[PDB]
């Protein structure tokens, strides 16, 4: 069947997401600063606007100290302007004070009538450096707390890094039910699995050999099962999709074309930046934009690959092209229509239909 | 003579601000929890929308762990929806990590094409308890840093609470120039003056006897002048304003009517708590203070009484007003149709010269984008 048991087993669809590129991540030629495509609100919202326009059911919103929009600001920016699309908010644990994060989570959740998914990154703070051990221990206690806000009356958490005995959750009650919003995050180190295992609702994978992926999927599930839980499974990958393959390979070679790479040329080139699979091009990795591989192929090639990834159990896709605008337009008109899509929160059953009996909703105000 | 020198001396106007009430602060009868008036986005934005509709030039956006909108979220909420009105964002220092705050500040600033003013509150964090000494020392280092972001190329700050050696400001460059956005905040405690002194652009005063205010204004200026700075001065007060005074006194007595106070009173045992909760001035009713809402006094009077009182406050040097009624919606409607049109208003940032006219040469604006 599926590589491992997946929480959304019986689901005959998948969440096909785009990318807001809030961290000056958008480009015309990779390595080439293009003024048109700075990560400004006008632009980045245009993406969300066009992404929703085309029927993408979520969009990742990254968070780093680069020129661009603060995640949570941008989400709230777009909340009024959006109708249908879910948001995937990057959130560095410890960055905003847990209880306040808990609130902001709620606030947004209500701003979006449930269309929210916190993505829990655990990296170093800007201008700060503390070791993995702590950073995860921290990101643990922060989710532990967010979870209390969403489930309990009162926050009672006596940790190594944080301590809260008896803090009303009324300020921080979210739109979503049944344990609160969904958490899409990954991690490969044991520490980052333990977390993806105890607390991932979704587990993200950066792109690899169809078999290497299986191994990740197992390695994750093993840790999840020890906490008596099943995960769902998602793929971050880039995208170059056209009618014809010799059009896609062409554009792909156009994207890196100006990049003054180590391979910009005793010329014994070890070029292990070629097609690790039929349609999985690791060449894009010669601009280390985080995602080091891209689906490249005809409409039908891409569609088949995603249909395969789906057969395995990968229930979410977090796609991203260059430009982020134009490439969403392609995949949108071409591949999207031909998938059965969903919103994981709607399926997982967290979002209610009419505004709920919350403090910020239809509850008794005390 | 204004009581003390004010930064906006020759300014023939004032910034007349309203109140978003994001901290379940809105009511019909004080002490009476009303579902109608939750601090939800729909509602609180309606205020900003109505407040801007009427020509209020700023709106304070408070920040506490009560049922309501997170400030900075709500500001960014309203940024797309607004055209004219400035926002005054409450900002608990240390709450968000300084460098990231610095960014968020920029992000918003650009979302608002300059229509931003951070209000620097220095209280305890939710579920946390730390001694005043530290809380201020912290709020110091946080402004010190925000200011670097707004002025310098990289952030270099070695503090007791925070340390950042050499952190590009490119991510965190604001829309505003000339020292960055404006800081409206108060404080009466020594520590809170020293700060309002070293770092207030505006200094906010909760309502008092026109003379008691003067004393605050002096005590503030002493600290400001010691740093070789002039402040501007702003008044938080509530509002009940009508055509007729015996209409305003009426509504006022209606607001506290349900409040289950010690004052809610045959062996004739009657205390004079109306000594404590009556008209300390002509039009300054301390009765609202029964509601132990933060602002313990309200302007109450005819249109023309209120207008005169504000014109008096203005003579002294108070160049900003942060007004708030009950309901927040309806009362803004009154003051708006009645008193507002009859004042010469402004935007302090526009006057202080911080906002530029065409989109600036910033990272997020019209600037050269540099390989990441």
Swiss-Prot record, chain A:
Keywords: Carbohydrate metabolism, Flavoprotein, FMN, Monooxygenase, Oxidoreductase. Its EC number is 1.14.14.181. The keyword Phosphoprotein does not apply. The keyword Oxidoreductase applies. PANTHER family: ALKANESULFONATE MONOOXYGENASE, ALKANESULFONATE MONOOXYGENASE-RELATED. Part of the sulfoquinovose monooxygenase (sulfo-SMO) pathway, a D-sulfoquinovose degradation pathway that enables the complete utilization of all carbons within sulfoquinovose (SQ) with concomitant production of inorganic sulfite. Catalyzes the oxidative desulfurization of sulfoquinovose to sulfite and 6-dehydro-D-glucose. Is highly specific for sulfoquinovose and cannot use sulfoquinovosyl glycerol. FMNH(2) is provided by the FMN reductase SmoA. This is Sulfoquinovose monooxygenase.
